[PDB]
Structure formats: structure tokens, C-alpha cells
Design a protein around this nucleic acid. Structure first.
Lengths: 175, 190, 109, 138, 247, 199
RNA sequence: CCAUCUGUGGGAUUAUGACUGAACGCCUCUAAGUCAGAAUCCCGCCCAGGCGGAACGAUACGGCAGCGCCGCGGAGCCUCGGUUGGCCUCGGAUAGCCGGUCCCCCGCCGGGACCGGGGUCCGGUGCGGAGUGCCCUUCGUCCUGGGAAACGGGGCGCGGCCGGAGAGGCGGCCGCCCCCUCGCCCGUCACGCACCGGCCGUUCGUGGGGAACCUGGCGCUAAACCAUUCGUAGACGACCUGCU
RNA sequence: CGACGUCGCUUUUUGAUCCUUCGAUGUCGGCUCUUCCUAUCAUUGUGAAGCAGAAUUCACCAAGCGUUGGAUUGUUCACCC
């Protein structure tokens, strides 16, 4: 695929109602796809992966995102991922910390592609859950709940090619 | 990772004095003054306290191989304190089997002459580091006493003299004759 | 009095990498140093000016050794501020690296 | 060494971005790049902006690891920031520079003549000063 | 293939713009490093090779086989009529080496030296420095000389004295004097410059310049032997004496 | 006038590229203090990458073979030639508008030196990496003028400090004169801060 | 080598052995920061000397000529690039800039008195205003009034005190002498409908670069090649030579 | 040192193939000459060893400098003083 900024769609589908039984049950999935067409297709991927249904024998009853509950509350997510690694499938439990669940998942994809160089076509998310400070576990996240935090901007540098290429002074890299 | 902060603090004895212009730390006490300018260590050296109780090294946003440096700088300035307040002394005993090592100090403070090594007629003039006083002692039969303030300096000179007297194309498991650093020490003791 | 034309550096030609078009010159206007600053110059008349052995005639004056190749800026080009301009004759290519006067004749302020 | 830390209540100038030129208080740090901010009396939505768009000042407030804008407004007006800031020199530089950048043409003709006269006056008195320095010099 | 046997390369590639030397006099390309740890003294000096001859001395090498015994050695008689010194040149240093700052010639210079500026003594008026001379006789010239020596004392930091030999004392056909700089090692440039100033226009002996039983170096243009073949020039074995078009 | 760039503190490529572009556009760029130009990377790796160039001669010849250059000036000049065209008349007439120098000559000594902060080391490189000076590189692989250039430049510096000192005194005198005659310029002190200057 | 002589000195480090010291309260040659290190490597010595430079000499009696230095005058050619200037501290980045003293002593009568630079104090600033987003110059000719002005301004005026070196351009001031006290900001009469009737190459670097020609003052009176000789050189050239 | 296993490298062997020349590239070996490579026989500096010394073996940085005189065959190859 080609991730932009993931938006957390929700899809509900079923097999077509055969004459044998008036209607089969209805299935709900929470799927991260940059647009709802890809949401539909990946829903079919998951469904055919789990139970013997295909879009040929199914219709997508509902397809739309879930707007974020309280997108102004900083929340730290634990994310249960399962990927493939050029030598065999690996389960894995990563962790992130952001505002919107979609933001957390997009961070997960970006940092899996970087820190573990597995493309976005081999990652299938199981769970993403906002969890409390007593269940967060990796230290990198853990160091960001302090009632008071202070840290300077250590070595700060910014752009000066639009500001002139040829200036007569030199930049200050303190404040 | 990039740990947000790491710190270390040294409680300075009052009988010493420390000045700083940026990373350059200068320590002046009873036995003299020392300088050391820590460029490319990239830390925050701060001095706090009435009678300058404590010094604080702080490393911001460091990685693992970079938090490693904080306690290194701690130990460096600690040994600087040890030198300025006490002074470092090293002691050398020269093992010999059939050729008694003849070491004399050709000039007073440095320039150690070494001869009669294994039968070698080759004299050596090992040049002690500047700011280091060599002194053959006398209460121990074969004893070199190296003294200074910068443990870097005294120990460097020490290993230099030890390594300059070694065999070539011989078994070092039986042939052993030579000088060696033996018992690392200071000048005066608590 | 004084000058009334912005300076310009004739800098190249619209070219892919191995095909060069001579009907669309590229200028770099000293003063504009990023796109979204062209919006003042678009459509400003611009001239190439130089000298030669034989004389010419000069409007409102006696003959002088100066000649001019007229033209105008047409559209913006690139994120850096380069501009495309078309002249009433393909530029003589001796001047890639020389000066162009970009005046203020059509002034849409 | 550093004399402007980033605290739970730091008050920061924005320098880049679409809110540029404004002032806004940090609320809480998300990570090492982005920190939720807002200024209710400075007309900015509560929204997570990077540090690279930020710029730091000396004004520090009091509120927790997350608060309501209702309460941060009272915290803001407690200090009455929009006077202390507008008194700081760092605002005078800004304001005078946009005064220049909006200084029109006829204003330029006033300024050229006035500054020219000032410079002649300055060189007048300065020349008197060189005359005076030598006579007492050694 | 690989060369089936290994033999040293013939000749030496470290002398290999091998050609006629444009100079006719050994052109010193170096000098002993300057040092103020000595009072000044010159360092180069011109002689002529007349021929060898024997010598007998009792050798002194202690402990060797021939010690304290007589041997004979073959010496080469270079004779050197005393030179005159006629000019002083200053050098300065720039990031690109040295630069010939300035020169000052003597008041009067002998015809042997004037003969080095010309090609047809017979066809010429021998008119060199005929104007320069008055910069010694007019006070204004003396003031300019003062300016020159002040500059050469301040900025310059290598000083050399122009000297030449005088053919008149010599049984060679030639009458054109051979001119060379000599670099003055010794104390500060002040001492060097003022001393050479005082030594302008006087005979220069030999025993002053060179010590006794010393160890010197000889620089000259070797004997010439015409456009020469390729078994004598680089010493390459002659092919067996039955080859074709060459051997 | 003509552009002049301090060479101290800049990187090699990050300065070569901009200088080449400017030259080929037409500015008569001059580079000075071309001996204190930095290189990104430790010293022995770069010395290896220089010897690996210095072996690129022929069998013996200079004809069939490249002309190395060992002074910092002409190493910079070589890199700029690399980023220019140098087999076409435009490229030659370009490369003959750049001029390098070591340290600083007099005609530019009493002249301002801008910089190119797109190339400065502090800007364009981390704190924890290693860099190697072009002065030391050249002096290792043969450049017989380290002492000479150092001494000449440090003599300039003592020449220039007194200029800077008199500049300080003159700026102070300007301050004093303004404060001493500012009973008649307040009208003028108005129409400056009115349109937004001096503050 | 069938006889004789002569054949050289440094720097940076690699292998490797170590100093200090964490990483990991210990340990550690290493991760920051150091040392010793060699037929290797780089330079020095020796060979040549670049559409690469330097210093210096002499620089044309048909004075009845060819030329140079000054101050302009006079055309004609052709080459074609711009279209105000910036005169300058080091440098630091996990820091600087700038002020003045209480203070530290240091070289020029320092120390016996005037003199800054050097340190150490403490104060104002810092997303740098003592800021290149910067600074200076900066805008048709004319009468009279207000403010700075008179310690002024100008003189290819004299001269001086003096200076300037990595490629001396150029620098101030001053003894004078002469000339105006007007030229700068704000106002008052105006003056060639300035001329262009709406309209392009005119609006300054400019007295620009190079060849070739007709004016006044002060100064120059040469060498090169051939021919010839020599043999310390030579295939022929080239080289070393002599020639009232 | 290294078996039973196994992964490579090199093109200093011999094969396999037919792409280039049949209106032509002169095809063995030797002699002379330059230069290059390193997987180092000797030498400079080093570690290791069942290393006391003396020799010798393994390994590291390393091609700057050496690597011969002859009987027999045309010999490359070999063999011997």
C-alpha cells in the first residue's frame, strides 16, 4: 500500500443472503486505511483470511471512519502487531504515544518501516488500545508522565538558505 | 532511545577552588593548579553551593554511547581533585635475574638513564613527562618513585618506562627482566 | 536620473536534459529568491541590450551602437524563483551568464 | 548553561508555520518533537505543533499535566501576559520591522531627507569630539 | 608471462629528464638551513678543475686492518683564485616560496663582471650601470640606499651576496667572470646584512669561507659524450653477436 | 563588487557546489582562507582517500597522467572544476572567474568577507561526528608552507586587531555624540522610530 | 668492479604493546581523550623547470632622428563589459556581544608622576538592533525667510610630519597659502508650455580597455642575430668562448 | 592439524561453448627490457607455540628491495651439483 496519514475506518459485512438461511450474521472490523476504498479491499483480505468469504460472495454493509473520541487528550497506546521478516513471521508488541489512534498507528507503520525495514504490505494489526501508565511498558514511552518535565532545546539549528545564501555574519546555535 | 537527562554530582572539598569558562575546568588547591579543557564532550558543567559544595555534570538528550561519557568526565575531574589535593605517586620495582638493572636519574627531575639490561650495552635515556619528578628511593632496594599531579601524566610516563625495557625475540614467559609499575599511589594520605 | 529596470541574469533555456529549446529563455531575477514572488513580474516586458560594430538607429535620438532584442516574461518556473521569458528572437547564446533588463512597462498595480 | 527550559507551563513564540508571528503557551509535552499548545486570549486552537515551529520566552505559568482552557485563561490573565510581552524588547523589534516593511514611498522620501540631516549633525558633533580628544590626549 | 628471472632495473629513473643542463655552472638548488647559532660566514664558493694527482698519508682509522700505515689516494686539484663580492640581494618569503625582494650592486664593478651582461664585447659599448653609479655619488641616492637597507633588514629573512671570480688571474682562455649568489648563515638578518654591506667590493679568500679537513659537496656539469647509443647510456647487454639489423 | 567567502569553518562540497553555481551564473567569486576548510569525517579516512588519489598517476608520465595538486587552494580549485564543465568554452570562461587564495592577500585583507551558512560546519553537521582540517591534510601529503602561511596570517591578525579597536572607540564616540547632541535631533529621532527603525 | 671516489635527513601514523576511563558502582587499549610504533606512506636531499611568477641593468646623435616623463589639446578606428558604494577582529556553539570601573600586575622615563593593550570584577543585550531583514552616499535651475553651521567647506594649491610588503594600488593629519562662508534640513517668489504631442538604446561606472595618427616643457644616445673565433659542445641547430 | 559434512573464492591448469576475424591478428620455447599483482621464500616492525637458548612452525601491517651460476632435453615442465 502507500500510507499517507491513516484514518481508522470501520467496516461491517456479510455473505449474501442465500435461500438456505434468510440471513447470515454481520461482522465488524476496525481497519486502518488512507481511504475507504482501500478500507473495503483490506476488509475483504481479512475476511477471506479468517472465514471462507470473498467479496464475490459478500457485500459490504457499512463503511465509514470512527471520528476520534477526544482528540485533545494525550494518550499512550499499546499496539499488538504481527509482521513478516524475510525469515519467518514474528509477533511483536510495540508502543507509541500520540493523540489520535490513527496517529498512533501511522507512527507504528513509519517506525516499523524504519527501525525494522518491513514494508507496509506485510503488517497486519491486531489490537491498538489506549492503556494507563501502569500498563505501558517500554521505557522510551515510560519516561513521559511527569507532573513536571523540563529539558532545554540542546543544540538548535534552523534554515538559512532562504535567508541569504551570502550573509556577512554567522549563525548563533545557542538560542 | 535518547534518554532525556542524565546527571552526576561531585561534592568538592572546601580546601580546593574551581574556576570555569565553558568546558575549561581549572582546579587550584594546596599542591598547585591544573587545567583541563573538555571539548567534544558536549556536557553541562555547573557549580552550585555556598563554599561551592557541589559540581553537576548534565547530559541532555543523550544516546547510550553518549551517556557513557558522563561518569567518565566525573572520574576525570575526580582524579584531578585527587592530584591537586594529594598528588599522585607511582612505585616501580625492576626484576632481574643475572644482570642487576642499573637505573640512575641522569638529570634531577627527569631523563632516567637505564643500563645493564640482560647484558645489553645499550644505554637508554627515558624522558619523563613534563611536570613529573622521578626519584630513586632507598628504603626499598630497587625502587623508582614517580611523582606528579596529573595521573594521566605520571601513569603515562610510568607505562612508558616499563615498556621501553623489554626483550626482543625472547620468551617472555621465562625471560622476565625489566621494570614494572607495581603499586599505584598518592603523595600524602588521610 | 536613475535606472528603472530590475536586473536579471539570463541563465539557460527550457531543456529536458539533452533537448534544448531556444524559444523559451530562463531568467533569474536578482531580487526574487523563491516562488510566489514572481506574481509581480508576470508579463513584465524585458529586453536584451548590447553593442556591435556597425551603427543602428535609435528612437527619439541619433544613431548609436546599441541594439536590443525585445521580449517579455511569461510564467513562473521552479520553486526557486526562476522565470520563463520569450523574446522576439531566439537569444544569441553568447550571453548565457549575462544581463537582461526586466522593466516595469506593463504595470498591473 | 541553558537559561530557558521547556516546562509544563512555558509560554512560547511561534516562528514558522501558519500561525507565525503569534504567541502561545505550551500545555504538555507529547514527545521529543511535538507538544500540545494553545493560547485562548491569543486566538489559537488547541493543537499539537512541533518544536521546530516554536520559540521560547521567559514567562512561566501554573497548571497541571492537562487543563481546561477555561482555567488556563485565568492562569494567563493572572500574569496579564499581553502587557509584559508587549513590554519586552523582542516585540519592539518585530513591530518596528513591520512598520518599515509597510513604510510606503513618500514616507521613504521623508526618511531619506531626515536621516541625511541626522547624519550630517552626527558627523558635526563627532568631528568636534575628535578635535576635543587629541587636545587632552598624550 | 612473468620475467623468468629477476635482475635490477638498469639505470636510475630518478635522473630522468636526462638531457643537457641549461646551466653551464653548477646551480646550487639548496643551502644549509639558516641558524643564528653562529657569527655570519659564507657557504658557497667557486673553483676550477685542473686535474688529479696522487697523495700519500698515514691512515688513522683506529682498529682497522690498515691502521697507522701508509696509503695513497687520488685527489683532484680544484684551484680557486680569490673571488670578489659585488652585490647584495634580499629574499622574502610568501606562501608561494621566496621572492627576490631587491638587489643592490656595488659602486664600481670590474670589466670581468661587466662582461657577463653582454654577448659582443667587440660590438658593444660596455655600458652597464653607467647611470646606476650616481646612486652612489649623489646624496639623494644615498638616502634611497638607506631606505633599501632598512627594508632588507626588516622584511627580508634570507640574504645572499652576489660574488664572482676574476679571470684575469687565470690561465684559462676565458675572460667572462662567473657570477653566483652566496647565502649567509649566521645571526640575525641585521648582523648578516650590515656585515655583508661592510664586505662589499673586497677580495674574498678561500680559507675564510671553507674550514680545514672539512666535508664539502661538489656541484658541476658533467662530461659530455654526444648523442650516444643504448648499451653505453643505460648499460644494457648486447644481444648475441649474430642478430639481424641490430645487435 | 565581487563576492568573497571566508574559507574557515565551511565544508568542502557544501561550499564547492554553491561557489560553482555562482561562478557559472557570473558572480566573480573569490575564496579566501582556503586552508581552514573542513572535511566531514575523521583524519585517517580522508588521508587514505587522498593517497588513493595520489596513486592515480600513470606509469611515470605527467602527460598521460593526472596533475595532482597538494596545496589547499588548488585542491578546492580542483573540486570546483569537478562541479563545473571544463571541456567547453563556457566552462573555461567560468572557471576563470573563481580565484582561490591561501589565508588572505592584501587587496582583500582590507575587505569584508561574507559567509555561506548553507555550508558552515556547525550548521550542516552533528556535534558528535569527526572532521579533518584541509590545512593538516595538505601539510601531511606535501605542502611546504604550513609555517609560512600560519605566521603571515597571525601577523595580519595583530595588524587587524588595532583596526577593530579604533572601530570600537569610534562606535563609542558615536554613542556619546548622539547622547550629547540629542536635544536637536529629537524631531529626527521621531521620523525614524515612526517608520520603524533603531528599535 | 679490469683501476679510483661518492651514495644522506624529518613528519604523520598501520600492525602491535600501553596510559587514563566508562559503557555495566567491578572490570576494560576505546566508546569520548592520550603515548611508543616500522625495509610501508608523505615530504626533505638529488633530476627538469609552467599559453607560472620575482629583482636589477641597458634601453637607438641621420643633435641635420628614433624615443621616453609631465599637463593638456585634436580628430579617426575598432573591442564591449557593467548601469551607487560597504575600509576589514578573532572566533564560540552544551554559548556570546558590549560597557565601565573597585581591583591584578605587565612593554612604552614603565617602575617618579600622564600611556592603551593583557587579566579579574560587576553591570545592559541576546532568536543578536554595538542586527547584512544592516550601514553610509543618494536625487530638475532659481530670489527671501527659520534651524545645524562658522573647530566649517573647496582647492589634480604648496609643502611638511609621517606610513604602507603575501601581489606599495593607497592613508590620515598638519605648518601654511588661496578662495566661499554659499552648498545641509524646513518654508517664500519663480524661471527656458525644460522639448520630446501617450509611449523603446539611455540614465553612470568613463577621463574604460588597444592599435594608428597632427600640439607645448623636461630627459635618453642602445643592444640582439648573422658573419667570425673557440671545443669545456657538438648529427645539423643549440652551448662555452675571443675579437684597439 | 582435521575425517565423516558444507560454503566460497581465483582464472597461474584442463575442459564446455562458438560471440569477433577464413578478401590472414605471423601461431612453441629461449634470449633482452619495462612494469604490475600478493595468497610473502629473504629483509624492516610485530603477536603466538607442546618456546629454556639455538634453530623452526602458525598469523598480522607490507610489494620498497632481492629471488642465482651450471650438466641433460627445443623445451614450458622436470631433475641434479
Amino acid at each position: 500500500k502507500a500510507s499517507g496519514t491513516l484514518r481508522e475506518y470501520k467496516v461491517v459485512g456479510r455473505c449474501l443472503p442465500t435461500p438456505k438461511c434468510h440471513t447470515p450474521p454481520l461482522y465488524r472490523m476496525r481497519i486502518f486505511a488512507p481511504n475507504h476504498v482501500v478500507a473495503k479491499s483490506r476488509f475483504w483480505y481479512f475476511v477471506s483470511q479468517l472465514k471462507k468469504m470473498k467479496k464475490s460472495s459478500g457485500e459490504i454493509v457499512y463503511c465509514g471512519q470512527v471520528f476520534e473520541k477526544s482528540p485533545l487528550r494525550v494518550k499512550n497506546f499499546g499496539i499488538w502487531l504481527r509482521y513478516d521478516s524475510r525469515s519467518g513471521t514474528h509477533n511483536m508488541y510495540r508502543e507509541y504515544r500520540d493523540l489520535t489512534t490513527a496517529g498512533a498507528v501511522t507512527q507504528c507503520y513509519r517506525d516499523m518501516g524504519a527501525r525494522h525495514r518491513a514494508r507496509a504490505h506485510s503488517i497486519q494489526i491486531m489490537k491498538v488500545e489506549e492503556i494507563a501508565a501502569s500498563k505501558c511498558r517500554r521505557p522510551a514511552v515510560k519516561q513521559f508522565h511527569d507532573s513536571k518535565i523540563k529539558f532545554p532545546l540542546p543544540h538548535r539549528v534552523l534554515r538559512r538558505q532562504h535567508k541569504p545564501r551570502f550573509t556577512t555574519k554567522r549563525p548563533n546555535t545557542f538560542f | 532511545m535518547k534518554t532525556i537527562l542524565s546527571n552526576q554530582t561531585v561534592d568538592i572539598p572546601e580546601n580546593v577552588d574551581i574556576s570555569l569558562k565553558g568546558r575549561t575546568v581549572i582546579v587550584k588547591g594546596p599542591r598547585g593548579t591544573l587545567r583541563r579543557d573538555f571539548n567534544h564532550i558536549n556536557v553541562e558543567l555547573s557549580l552550585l553551593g555556598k563554599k561551592k559544595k557541589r559540581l553537576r555534570v548534565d547530559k541532555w538528550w543523550g544516546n547510550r554511547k553518549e551517556l557513557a561519557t558522563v561518569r567518565t568526565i566525573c572520574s576525570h575531574v575526580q582524579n584531578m581533585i585527587k592530584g591537586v589535593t594529594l598528588g599522585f605517586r607511582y612505585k616501580m620495582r625492576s626484576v632481574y635475574a643475572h644482570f642487576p638493572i642499573n637505573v640512575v636519574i641522569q638529570e634531577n627531575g627527569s631523563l632516567v638513564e637505564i643500563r645493564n639490561f640482560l647484558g645489553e650495552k645499550y644505554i637508554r635515556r627515558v624522558r619523563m613527562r613534563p611536570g613529573v619528578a622521578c626519584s630513586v628511593s632507598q628504603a626499598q632496594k630497587d625502587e623508582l618513585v614517580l611523582e606528579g599531579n596529573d595521573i594521566e601524566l605520571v601513569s603515562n610516563s610510568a607505562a612508558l618506562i616499563q615498556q621501553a625495557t623489554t626483550v626482543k625475540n625472547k620468551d617472555i614467559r621465562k625471560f622476565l627482566d625489566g621494570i614494572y609499575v607495581s603499586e599505584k599511589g598518592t603523595v600524602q594520605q588521610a | 536620473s536613475g535606472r528603472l529596470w530590475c536586473k536579471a541574469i539570463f541563465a539557460g533555456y527550457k531543456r529536458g536534459l539533452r533537448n534544448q529549446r531556444e524559444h523559451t529563455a530562463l531568467l533569474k531575477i536578482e531580487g526574487v529568491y523563491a516562488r510566489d514572488e514572481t506574481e509581480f513580474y508576470l508579463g513584465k516586458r524585458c529586453a536584451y541590450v548590447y553593442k556591435a560594430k556597425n551603427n543602428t538607429v535609435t528612437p527619439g535620438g541619433k544613431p548609436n551602437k546599441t541594439r536590443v532584442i525585445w521580449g517579455k516574461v511569461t510564467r513562473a518556473h521552479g520553486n526557486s524563483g526562476m522565470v520563463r521569458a520569450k523574446f522576439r528572437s531566439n537569444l544569441p547564446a553568447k550571453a548565457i551568464g549575462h544581463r537582461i533588463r526586466v522593466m516595469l512597462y506593463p504595470s498591473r498595480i | 548553561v541553558f537559561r530557558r527550559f521547556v516546562e509544563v507551563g512555558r509560554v512560547a513564540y511561534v516562528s514558522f508555520g501558519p500561525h507565525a508571528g503569534k504567541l502561545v503557551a505550551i500545555v504538555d509535552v507529547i514527545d521529543q518533537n511535538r507538544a500540545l499548545v494553545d493560547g485562548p486570549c491569543t486566538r489559537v486552537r488547541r493543537q499539537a505543533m512541533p518544536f521546530k515551529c516554536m520559540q521560547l520566552t521567559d514567562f512561566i505559568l501554573k497548571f497541571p499535566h492537562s487543563a481546561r482552557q477555561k482555567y488556563v485563561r485565568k492562569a494567563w490573565e493572572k500574569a496579564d501576559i499581553n502587557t509584559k510581552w508587549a513590554a519586552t524588547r523582542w516585540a519592539k523589534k518585530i513591530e518596528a520591522r513591520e512598520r518599515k516593511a509597510k513604510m510606503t514611498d513618500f514616507d521613504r522620501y521623508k526618511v531619506m531627507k531626515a536621516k541625511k540631516m541626522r547624519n550630517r549633525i552626527i558627523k558635526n558633533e563627532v568631528k568636534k569630539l575628535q578635535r576635543a580628544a587629541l587636545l587632552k590626549a598624550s | 608471462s612473468h620475467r623468468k628471472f629477476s635482475a635490477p632495473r638498469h639505470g636510475s629513473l630518478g635522473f630522468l629528464p636526462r638531457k643537457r643542463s641549461s646551466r653551464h655552472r653548477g646551480k646550487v638548488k639548496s643551502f644549509p638551513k639558516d641558524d643564528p647559532s653562529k657569527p655570519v660566514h659564507l657557504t658557497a664558493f667557486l673553483g676550477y678543475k685542473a686535474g688529479m694527482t696522487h697523495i700519500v698519508r698515514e691512515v688513522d682509522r683506529p682498529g682497522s686492518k690498515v691502521n697507522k700505515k701508509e696509503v695513497v689516494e687520488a685527489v683532484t686539484i680544484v684551484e680557486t683564485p680569490p673571488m670578489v663580492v659585488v652585490g647584495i640581494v634580499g629574499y622574502v618569503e610568501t606562501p608561494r616560496g621566496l621572492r627576490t625582494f631587491k638587489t643592490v650592486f656595488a659602486e664600481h664593478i670590474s670589466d670581468e663582471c661587466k662582461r657577463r651582461f653582454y654577448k659582443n664585447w667587440h660590438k658593444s659599448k660596455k655600458k652597464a650601470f653607467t647611470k646606476y653609479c650616481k646612486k652612489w655619488q649623489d646624496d639623494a641616492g644615498k638616502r634611497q640606499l638607506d631606505k633599501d637597507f632598512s627594508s632588507m633588514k626588516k622584511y627580508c629573512q634570507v640574504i645572499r651576496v652576489l660574488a664572482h671570480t676574476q679571470m684575469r688571474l687565470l690561465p684559462l682562455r676565458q675572460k667572462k667572470a662567473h657570477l653566483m649568489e652566496i647565502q649567509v648563515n649566521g645571526g640575525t638578518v641585521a648582523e648578516k646584512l650590515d656585515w655583508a654591506r661592510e664586505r662589499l667590493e673586497q677580495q674574498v679568500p678561500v680559507s675564510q669561507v671553507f674550514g680545514q679537513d672539512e666535508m664539502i659537496d661538489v656541484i658541476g656539469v658533467t662530461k659530455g659524450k654526444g648523442y650516444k647509443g643504448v648499451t653505453s647510456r643505460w648499460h644494457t647487454k648486447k644481444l648475441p653477436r649474430k642478430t639481424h639489423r641490430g645487435l | 563588487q565581487v563576492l568573497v567567502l571566508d574559507g574557515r569553518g565551511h565544508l568542502l562540497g557544501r561550499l564547492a557546489a554553491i561557489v560553482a553555481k555562482q561562478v557559472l551564473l557570473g558572480r566573480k567569486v573569490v575564496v579566501v582562507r582556503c586552508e581552514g576548510i573542513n572535511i566531514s569525517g575523521n583524519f585517517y579516512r580522508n588521508k587514505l582517500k587522498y593517497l588513493a588519489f595520489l596513486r592515480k598517476r600513470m606509469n611515470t608520465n605527467p602527460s598521460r597522467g593526472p596533475y595532482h595538486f597538494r596545496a589547499p587552494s588548488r585542491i578546492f580549485w580542483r573540486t570546483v572544476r569537478g562541479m563545473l564543465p571544463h571541456k567547453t568554452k563556457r566552462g573555461q570562461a567560468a572557471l576563470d572567474r573563481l580565484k582561490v587564495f591561501d589565508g588572505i592577500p592584501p587587496p582583500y585583507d582590507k575587505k569584508k568577507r561574507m559567509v555561506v551558512p548553507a555550508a558552515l560546519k556547525v550548521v550542516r553537521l552533528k556535534p558528535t561526528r569527526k572532521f579533518a582540517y584541509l590545512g593538516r591534510l595538505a601539510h601531511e601529503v606535501g605542502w611546504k608552507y604550513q609555517a609560512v602561511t600560519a605566521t603571515l596570517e597571525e601577523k595580519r591578525k595583530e595588524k587587524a586587531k588595532i583596526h577593530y579597536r579604533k572601530k570600537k572607540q569610534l562606535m563609542r564616540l558615536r554613542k556619546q555624540a548622539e547622547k550629547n547632541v540629542e536635544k536637536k535631533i529629537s524631531k529626527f529621532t521621531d521620523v525614524l522610530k515612526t517608520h520603524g527603525l533603531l528599535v
